[PDB]
Amino acid sequence: RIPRKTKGKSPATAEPGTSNCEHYKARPGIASVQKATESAELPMKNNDEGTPDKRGNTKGALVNEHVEARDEADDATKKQAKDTEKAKAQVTYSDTGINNANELSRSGNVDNEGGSNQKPMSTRIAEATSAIVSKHPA
Amino acid sequence: DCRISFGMNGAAPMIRDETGMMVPFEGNWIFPLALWQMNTRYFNQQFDAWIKTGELRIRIEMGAYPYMLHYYDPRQYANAWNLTSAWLEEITPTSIPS
Amino acid sequence: GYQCHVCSAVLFSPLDLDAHVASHGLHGNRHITEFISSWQNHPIVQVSADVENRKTAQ
Amino acid sequence: IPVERYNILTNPDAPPTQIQLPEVVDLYNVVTRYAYETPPITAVVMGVP
Ligand SMILES: [Zn+2]
């Protein structure tokens, strides 16, 4: 049966019409297009930070966004330079020429509620429960 | 616009005319050479068995070509299907043989 | 050698012919898509991602 | 034993595809089984002059 990719909740003579031989070279190169369209096929990369996890916490990195997006833009330009053979990238995403000071991406400084996730949400909820508790006497 | 509809249950496979009609693998036909070149594989598994035995007759217009001569003794048997099968096979979208 | 008439694929086994005609929906006593050109002999098929052992497949 | 859940067996006048689904669920209903075929996508690709 078909396996599961993710983890789960657990006389007749041969007719003379053909005899194959290689004759026609592919003029743009069929495998050379095949590798490039394999590379172009690649699906959409996940961006899941800033979203609630299983327990209720964000899945980010405790960075505010004005440094976070500049960081990931510089890292994208660095990966672009690694993808190219050259050392300094021609196309760049950081320090392009226009300013980007009113900018903010998604990451895990802020929760959904709007406050700072310097403490976990599960910690805050368990804290609010444990603030009021009653114990029977002796 | 030239498509090949296969035959079923013994009925004849047919071909698309430029008048939009459909016709079996019979009768005198006229091709531009470029059509044969663009589908030079897929026609070979469709036509050659009808060329060798049936009376399907094709005239392929191309204007100019280099040519090859082969001679024979008329006192004996002769057959050209090896040379013609070689030629019809070796037609390439890029090139043609003589 | 073998070949089917509904395509121009070159086949070898009679069980391979019986397997191939089921793609067109025939019957006699696997992949995700199967293409075939009309000038070259380079047919291309495609297979799912998790399955290993790619043998000229996308 | 619940007579009200087996409508087809206990009503001689019940239509076969009758359900009373929002009120009470039945058992022993009229299920319709299939047998399809999903082929892979094929294409014969011709050039053009
Ligand atoms: Zn076929």
| Helix B81-90, helix B44-52: angle, nearest 10 | 160
Closest CA to B57 of B35, B79, B31, B90: B31
What distance in Å separates the CA atoms of residue A131 and residue A123, rounded to the nearest whole number? 12
Q: Spell out the long-range contacts of B4-7 with Cβ–Cβ below 8 A and sequence spacing 24 or more.
A: B4/B42, B4/B46, B6/C5, B6/C6, B7/C5
Computed over its alpha carbons, how large is the radius of gyration of chain A? 28
Contacts of A7 in chain C (CB under 8 A): none
C10 assigned binding-site residue: no
Smallest CA–CA separation between D47 and chain C, in Å?
7
Scanning every residue of chain B, which has its alpha carbon at the shortest distance from the alpha carbon of C36?
A: B42
C24 assigned binding-site residue: yes
Smallest CA–CA separation between B1 and chain D, in Å?
8
What distance in Å separates the CA atoms of residue A79 and residue A57, rounded to the nearest whole number? 29
- CB B3 to CB D49 under 8 A? no
> Is residue B15 helix, strand or coil?
strand
What distance in Å separates the CA atoms of residue D31 and residue A116, rounded to the nearest whole number? 55
* Sequence-ordered list of residues with C-beta below 8 angstroms from that of C21, at least 6 positions apart, any chain: C4, C6, C27, C28
Contacts of B93 in chain D (CB under 8 A): 47
Both tokens of residue A89?
């990238």
> D29 CA to middle of ligand 1, Å?
43
> A107 CA to middle of ligand 1, Å?
52
B98 in Cβ contact with B67 (< 8 Å): yes
- What secondary structure, in 3-state letters, does D17-33 show? CCCCCCCCCCCCCCCCC
Place of tokens 């034993």: D1
> A15 CA to middle of ligand 1, Å?
17
What distance in Å separates the CA atoms of residue A111 and residue A49, rounded to the nearest whole number? 10
C42 assigned binding-site residue: no
Number of helices (H), then strands (E), belonging to chain D: the values are 1, 1
Q: Indicate if the alpha-carbon torsion angle C12, C18, C19, C24 is positive or negative.
A: positive
Name the method of structure determination: cryo-EM
Beta bridge mates, B59:
B30
